[PDB]
Amino acid sequence: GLTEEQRMMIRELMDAQMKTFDTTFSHFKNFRLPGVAAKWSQVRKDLCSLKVSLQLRGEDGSVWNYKPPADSGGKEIFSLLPHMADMSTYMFKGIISFAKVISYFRDLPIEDQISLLKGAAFELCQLRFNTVFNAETGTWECGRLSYCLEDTGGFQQLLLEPMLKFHYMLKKLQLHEEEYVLMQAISLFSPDRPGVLQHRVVDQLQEQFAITLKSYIECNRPQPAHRFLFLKIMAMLTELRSINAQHTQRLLRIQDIHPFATPLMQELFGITGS
Numbered sequence: 001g002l003t004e005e006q007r008m009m010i011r012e013l014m015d016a017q018m019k020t021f022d023t024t025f026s027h028f029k030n031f032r033l034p035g036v037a038a039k040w041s042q043v044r045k046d047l048c049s050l051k052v053s054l055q056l057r058g059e060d061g062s063v064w065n066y067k068p069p070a071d072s073g074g075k076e077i078f079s080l081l082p083h084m085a086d087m088s089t090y091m092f093k094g095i096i097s098f099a100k101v102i103s104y105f106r107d108l109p110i111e112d113q114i115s116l117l118k119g120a121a122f123e124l125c126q127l128r129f130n131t132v133f134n135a136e137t138g139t140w141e142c143g144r145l146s147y148c149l150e151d152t153g154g155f156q157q158l159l160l161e162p163m164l165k166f167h168y169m170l171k172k173l174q175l176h177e178e179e180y181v182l183m184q185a186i187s188l189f190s191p192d193r194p195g196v197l198q199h200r201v202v203d204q205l206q207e208q209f210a211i212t213l214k215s216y217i218e219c220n221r222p223q224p225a226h227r228f229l230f231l232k233i234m235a236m237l238t239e240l241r242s243i244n245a246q247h248t249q250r251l252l253r254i255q256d257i258h259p260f261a262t263p264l265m266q267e268l269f270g271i272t273g274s
């Protein structure tokens with residue numbers, strides 16, 4: 001029951017997703033790995049909230065496993081930062097390529113493209129990561145890389161971290177590929193990001209992506225479990241925006257006392273190099 005324009009709109013987004021999302025992470029390579037005063041207290045809280053072990057499955061059948069150190073009041077809490085910087089950079093590139101393929105994005109002024117990507121790159125990265133999240137094992141399955149949440153409390157204590165609660169709650173909605181990519185579009189075309197000039201154009205595009213999503217759900221999900229699903233998704237996007245703001249401040253705090261951001265991360269977060 002979608003209109004012609006809505007069916008074309010979903011197809012272009014699905015097309016962009018297919019072309020730019022390396023779902024097996026086969027081209028993520030050359031990444032760094034861990035080696036073989038009230039600020040620090042806050043940075044310690046910042047880093048200790050998302051602790052993961054790492055596994056690497058070699059193409060030959062070998063397996064490397066990394067278990068992170070406990071916080072002992074030292075630099076060891078930074079040991080996974082270079083690797084995560086490389087992974088974030090890889091995802092950011094796919095997100096930039098995603099936006100560039102979309103006609104509605106490419107027709108915006110170049111200054112607004114940059115402002116929208118700076119505002120939504122993290123959110124779109126999280127949305128893509130959720131599609132490889134395994135909620136039963138607490139693992140992001142990134143092809144031959146796996147990131148497994150470290151035990152602690154149990155899961156209920158882990159779900160107090162908002163980013164982890166977001167991933168579990170979003171996964172439980174059991175969304176289709178089309179609903180994920182419409183969420184990426186609504187997030188990308190947010191008219192209220194810092195520096196956006198064509199505010200009215202972006203707002204109208206966002207409204208159309210949300211209408212298409214509302215219509216998609218109504219045409220393809222009649223089950224009582226999916227009542228209010230559209231409103232649940234919009235609430236998740238509002239929460240993802242809040243998480244985006246928390247993560248930025250948390251990144252800038254860590255960067256203030258222990259630099260790690262790659263050049264592309266610096267560009268996206270307003271770090272000038274000076």
Ligand SMILES: ClC1=C(Cl)[C@]2(Cl)[C@@H]3[C@@H](Cl)[C@@H](Cl)C[C@@H]3[C@@]1(Cl)C2(Cl)Cl
Binds near residue numbers: 084087088125140147
């Ligand atoms: Cl935190 C955090 C880590 Cl760690 C992972 Cl790998 C990923 C890194 Cl690359 C940044 Cl983009 C934030 C996400 C999450 Cl939420 C996951 Cl777990 Cl997907």
